[PDB]
């Protein structure tokens, strides 16, 4: 395939426009008073939305290059959200702000490498300043607080989160299920979560969450790399006539059997999904045996002689639920006997007696933790089904912000925190006069979100910005009610993680671009 | 197919532009402070990279001719890397430098054949000067030294290489595997490597290495040219139901069965790969029997009556691993009995008693060497999987530079060595005034890499160049930290092999072009 | 600049031009940095009034025939 190669300035101009289209479309939705974007849909009526993440997802441009610009910012702003729970739009909004002003600078004839340095410093510094501005969220009171606010003034959502964390810990695994009655429920139950995601997006059966939800499935616990679909035919035919889903956990699943299982589910007979086993090497042995114990299943080790062709249902594990996403698998309520699960705990606890390394002790502890520690489930109760799966959604929203609030605390939410940290480091210098510009570009970029919220509301940005800067701490403007005050008191807050992540991620992609000299893509 | 023929100047102009696009895209990434190239990718977000090898791989132009230019430099720079372990970019950057200036000369109306002579002399001379500048790397201390530097200050990587060479020799075969724990491991084990590569690129299952990694496969040791796929059906069906890969070593594999095995793997049932047998004629007989002994497999000789249709698993050899690349096959840990492998050694060692030729003695010795000499495996330990396959990668990088450092020593790495050798032979003359231009073109091309590193950093080239020239030996500029000093002391070094290879290879393609009068290609 | 330089002393027109291209290049770069052009000007002018005093200070009289031949020659 013959390519189209663009250099230096051309390259960067194309990139800029690319990003501008992304940002201009996505940014008009930022405030509590965003504008609508209309998103066409092949069949039927269009979609009117104020949700930046929705707008972003749709942006793809004709001009490759221009497209690459847009797709780059998209990628990194989505990572912001990946790591924080929010900011996708903010990240984009900031990304534009740096890219625009930095990119003008390079084009004026200043030094890219220095401009990056300056920006990078300005960010490093502001991230610190953010940690300082940050108000902790540690006690049950504070947990419930950010929960309730994050769940839109609903005090019962704040409660349920606070209670869950109060039961399994700030670290402990908390999931959300559909409610059976009008009443909320909180139960702790044998289970586990491990940092491993789906092997294929085509496994997703809940498009809105980008997630895989499987109802009381069997669990296959292989130990080899599943490459051929042949080993499957006995077990995949038993879990077919059992009319139930099937979760596969093994070394891996290679295309040969992966791509088949993929098309086998996406409009096909047995609906299943597979994920890699937790850990690598000597760890995975026992780490997989843990899940076996928890689900009362048998581990099919090749190092013992057993094959997958030599496996029946009696070998498969079982759990009342299991959700997989991009990069997490969590199994809920394992049928594994109490006498077994408590037995395994006793085995591992003893093994900690070894204490040959603070790595081995801590690593065996993480295993005891997952196993005996359990998973706390929230069942969201409501009157109507519409209310139900809506409240359920806000509970998941709140849980997100709360996990994030615990880690790094909360700060002024209106753009405010960023405006604040910037007016603090307004002496900052570098060594190049070019690095100064770098720092300034970055600093003035940090006003973007507030200025934008205000703009979206139809108010003057400069005026609101100036008076927010005039203050201190978390004094800010609440665009929703147009009153100045303490943003946190007023219940307008972002977790520190998310404001930081947004900023850092915007800064990364901006630097990347300011230092891009070449761009390769296919011919139109 | 009707062709488009271009002559003399036209031909060369097209060639020049072709090479310039290659070099301008690839060169911006050279320093420790390279710029980014954005490389579009059909689905998903683009790739941002500073890796010249990655950039080059993507470069292909629309204008055939222009493309041929680019492709030619690509070919030769990749060979540099093939033979040295690095320099792909440097070769390209120098290739441009000669091609530009030489090609202007020819076009000005000077003699191509002399211009080549002059360049070729300048190179011959500089290669010598490099040998002089070169600092040996011989003892365990020096091995670990270049290892650690080449692995980015990591002293443990330098150690493990030094230890491996300390176990199986500076020649002995050292491979790298994924680690099972947190601990590094070094084991010596029965194995072998021979200079023979895959018969098809579609065998590659690790795209990032351009290599074939097969997990404890069976090994077929045929003796005929495998042309028909019919002979296979018994053995290819046993190693299918055995759920294992299969390595074929025979005279060759002809399209009829090659192209079938190809499509049979690239998205197909049994995943396999085949390579030609080592040696030719009377040598290959015993040379293949060696591998048999090592893997405890049976050799299927047509000269005995046995066919491949008359072969079961019991005939196939076995080894815990095997990696194939462009032009190397190395099998790791052969299951062949110790009583057998040591027995074969005794047979061959005795055969050396013959001593009828210093060719036959040395040839039987190379066989004893491979067989009883063994293969040293490094298992790279790490805490996380990301760290693991990252550290594993730098270990392979270091091993590369170390094997090269042993062979020809090390020199100043910042471009420095080249800048140095150039300012040394700055009197050099030829007979034609045209040959002078040739020498000067070449000499001045040798400043290209340093000038470029400096430029990518955003510093002045001329100024850094002049002051590096002003010194002696391995005094240079370290672009990473911007201090002058002894490049080797400061830990910025290139193996002599690689700097040379790069230069020679760039010089070859440049002269080839300066002497090209015609270009034939397909019609647009 | 090139023209006035010439009406003034009939030499140095290239130099003049070169300087102007240089003050302009640099100055415009600083206007793009967001500086106030009227001040950039005041700075440039202050710099120059100072430079001219400096020159009048470096100037040594050219009065012997050898020195005259030297300016002629260089011109
Ligand atoms: N030998 C030389 N080395 C360096 N500078 C020289 C030399 N000869 C003349 N010059 C300088 O070069 C300048 C060029 O004069 P010229 O090319 O006529 O430019 P202009 O039109 O501005 O007078 C003079 O200012 C003089 O200082
Ligand atoms: Mg003059």
UniProtKB/Swiss-Prot annotation, chains A, B:
<keyword id="KW-0413">Isomerase</keyword>
<feature type="binding site">
    <location>
        <position position="494"/>
    </location>
    <ligand>
        <name>ATP</name>
    </ligand>
</feature>
<feature type="binding site">
    <location>
        <begin position="86"/>
        <end position="90"/>
    </location>
    <ligand>
        <name>ATP</name>
    </ligand>
</feature>
<dbReference type="InterPro" id="IPR027409">
    <property type="entry name" value="GroEL-like_apical_dom_sf"/>
</dbReference>
<dbReference type="InterPro" id="IPR027410">
    <property type="entry name" value="TCP-1-like_intermed_sf"/>
</dbReference>
<keyword id="KW-0963">Cytoplasm</keyword>
<dbReference type="GO" id="GO:0042026">
    <property type="term" value="P:protein refolding"/>
</dbReference>
<dbReference type="GO" id="GO:0051082">
    <property type="term" value="F:unfolded protein binding"/>
</dbReference>
<dbReference type="GO" id="GO:0005524">
    <property type="term" value="F:ATP binding"/>
</dbReference>
<comment type="subunit">
    <text>Forms a cylinder of 14 subunits composed of two heptameric rings stacked back-to-back. Interacts with the co-chaperonin GroES.</text>
</comment>
<keyword id="KW-0143">Chaperone</keyword>
<feature type="binding site">
    <location>
        <begin position="29"/>
        <end position="32"/>
    </location>
    <ligand>
        <name>ATP</name>
    </ligand>
</feature>
<dbReference type="InterPro" id="IPR018370">
    <property type="entry name" value="Chaperonin_Cpn60_CS"/>
</dbReference>
<keyword id="KW-0067">ATP-binding</keyword>
<dbReference type="GO" id="GO:0005737">
    <property type="term" value="C:cytoplasm"/>
</dbReference>
<dbReference type="GO" id="GO:0140662">
    <property type="term" value="F:ATP-dependent protein folding chaperone"/>
</dbReference>
<dbReference type="InterPro" id="IPR001844">
    <property type="entry name" value="Cpn60/GroEL"/>
</dbReference>
<dbReference type="Pfam" id="PF00118">
    <property type="entry name" value="Cpn60_TCP1"/>
</dbReference>
<comment type="function">
    <text>Together with its co-chaperonin GroES, plays an essential role in assisting protein folding. The GroEL-GroES system forms a nano-cage that allows encapsulation of the non-native substrate proteins and provides a physical environment optimized to promote and accelerate protein folding.</text>
</comment>
<keyword id="KW-0547">Nucleotide-binding</keyword>
<dbReference type="InterPro" id="IPR027413">
    <property type="entry name" value="GROEL-like_equatorial_sf"/>
</dbReference>
<dbReference type="GO" id="GO:0016853">
    <property type="term" value="F:isomerase activity"/>
</dbReference>
<feature type="binding site">
    <location>
        <position position="414"/>
    </location>
    <ligand>
        <name>ATP</name>
    </ligand>
</feature>
<feature type="binding site">
    <location>
        <begin position="478"/>
        <end position="480"/>
    </location>
    <ligand>
        <name>ATP</name>
    </ligand>
</feature>
<protein>
    <recommendedName>
        <fullName>Chaperonin GroEL</fullName>
        <ecNumber>5.6.1.7</ecNumber>
    </recommendedName>
</protein>
<dbReference type="InterPro" id="IPR002423">
    <property type="entry name" value="Cpn60/GroEL/TCP-1"/>
</dbReference>
<feature type="binding site">
    <location>
        <position position="50"/>
    </location>
    <ligand>
        <name>ATP</name>
    </ligand>
</feature>
<comment type="similarity">
    <text>Belongs to the chaperonin (HSP60) family.</text>
</comment>
